[PDB]
Each structure stands twice: as structure tokens, then as C-alpha cells.
């Protein structure tokens, strides 16, 4: 299912041309799951991300 | 970025070192005294010397700094260095020697010393670090 999220701390900006920010992502269900994700676009700390598959992992492309 | 070149820092260091009594924390009265002490080609350098001086005067309250040397600290360090305690740290009535130290003193005919209190020597010969 779809899962709504939050941003704890932005880690670093990865990608082929530096287009992807890599971000440490908390959930909004009071969950202690601090997943790391690949977000494309401008991000600061304290965003509200919206994922479709909430079990994916951060790689470096 | 905003890094101050050797001209600003060299001039600021000499003008602290010579005129520390007039300089305080306000950048504005620092600028009004840095244009009466020194002959600076004008303002955009004058306000950069006076700003590093205003950042450098706050750095003197928190202790010495590794460049300049000013004679309000260097009298306090002088009175800190001429400090003797009342009774020295080498006047101990019970000083501790090994067994073998007492043998060296007996070679030096100092076995009649009364203050020496020989300790029990260590039971294990374990001093090397565990290599590997």
C-alpha cells in the first residue's frame, strides 16, 4: 500500500549528475523505521515524503 | 566566501599589539580609533581591519592567542610563572623505594636514610604489551 512519511536528516546528494538527494526517512505511524530513500527534487529537513513501495532501499545509481 | 587576506590580518595584529587599551568590542568605536591610529587607504579596507580587530578583541578575553603578545596577559603569565608553593612537593616524609633501589643506595652508602619506606615488589613479571 501507499505510505506517508517524514524527513529526519538529509544525508548527501548522490546520482549520476547529482540530481538525487539521499534522505533519512521516518514514517508517520509513530514508527521507529528510519528508512533511507532516493528523492529527486529540492528537499530540506522536515519534509513530508509520500512513497508508493515503502520497503525499498537506498542505493547509489 | 569571506576570508581576510594577509594585509587585513597583519595590520590588525600589529594594531592590536600596539593599541590594546583603546580597542574594545564595539566595531564602530574600533573603526573610529583604527582611522586615527593608522593611515589606511580608505573605508572598504578600514572597515575590514576594524572588523577583524572586533573579532580579535573578543578572542583575547577567552585566553591568549598564538600570534600577538600583549602586556596584560604577559604580566599575568609572568606572575603565574614565578609561583612557588609554601612547602614543596619534594618534602615527603614517607617516600617509596623498591627493594632494588635500596640496594643502589647501599652501594652509594645511603642505607642509613630513615625516610625510605620500601614497598612490596610486584609479584608478576608482566610489563610487555600483548603483541598480536
Amino acid at each position: 500500500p501507499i505510505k506517508l512519511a517524514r524527513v529526519t536528516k538529509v544525508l548527501g546528494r548522490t546520482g549520476s549528475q547529482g540530481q538525487c538527494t539521499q534522505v533519512r526517512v521516518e514514517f508517520m505511524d509513530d514508527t521507529s523505521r528510519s528508512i533511507i530513500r532516493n528523492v529527486k527534487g529540492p528537499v530540506r529537513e522536515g519534509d513530508v515524503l509520500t512513497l508508493l513501495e515503502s520497503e525499498r532501499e537506498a542505493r547509489r545509481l | 566566501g569571506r576570508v581576510r587576506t594577509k594585509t587585513v590580518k597583519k595590520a590588525a595584529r600589529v594594531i592590536i599589539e600596539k593599541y590594546y587599551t583603546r580597542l574594545g568590542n564595539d566595531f564602530h568605536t574600533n573603526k573610529r580609533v583604527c582611522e586615527e591610529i593608522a593611515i589606511i587607504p580608505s573605508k572598504k579596507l578600514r572597515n575590514k581591519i576594524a572588523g577583524y580587530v572586533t573579532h580579535l578583541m573578543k578572542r583575547i578575553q577567552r585566553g591568549p592567542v598564538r600570534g600577538i603578545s600583549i602586556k596584560l596577559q604577559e604580566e599575568e603569565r609572568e606572575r603565574r610563572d614565578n609561583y612557588v608553593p609554601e612547602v614543596s612537593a619534594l618534602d615527603q616524609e614517607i617516600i617509596e623505594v623498591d627493594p632494588d633501589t635500596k640496594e643502589m643506595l647501599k652501594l652509594l652508602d645511603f642505607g642509613s636514610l630513615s625516610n625510605l619506606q620500601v614497598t612490596q615488589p610486584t609479584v608478576g613479571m608482566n610489563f610487555k604489551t600483548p603483541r598480536g
Binding site: - | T7, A11, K18, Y19, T21, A38, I39, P41, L45
Partner: protein, 56 residues
């Protein structure tokens, strides 16, 4: 910049002179270079030891 005509051709001569300071009693520019900060050497403040009220 000047020219010379020799036997074989032309030479050029370029001569630059960096002039000195000393405000112009006949020589040099007036103002110093824009990075040359001079600092007035302080006559030391004499040490005030006891309050003397000099009524003059």
C-alpha cells in the same frame, strides 16, 4: 615605448619605471599604494601611579 632602426631592421624598446612615494616635494606620487597600511608608533602611556591634583 620607442623604436630603433638598426642596419637589419627595427627594434622596440619598452621601459617601465615604478616611481616611489614621498609626497611631492618634486618626486613621485602623493598617495601610498592601496594595500600599504602604515601604523603610527605609540609613545607609551606613562604609568599613572598616585592621584596628583595639579591645580594650575
Amino acid at each position: 615605448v620607442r623604436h630603433v632602426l638598426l642596419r637589419q631592421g627595427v627594434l622596440g624598446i619598452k621601459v617601465k619605471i615604478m616611481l616611489p612615494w614621498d609626497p611631492t616635494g618634486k618626486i613621485g606620487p602623493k598617495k601610498p599604494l592601496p594595500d600599504h597600511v602604515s601604523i603610527v608608533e605609540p609613545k607609551d602611556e606613562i604609568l599613572p601611579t598616585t592621584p596628583i591634583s595639579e591645580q594650575k
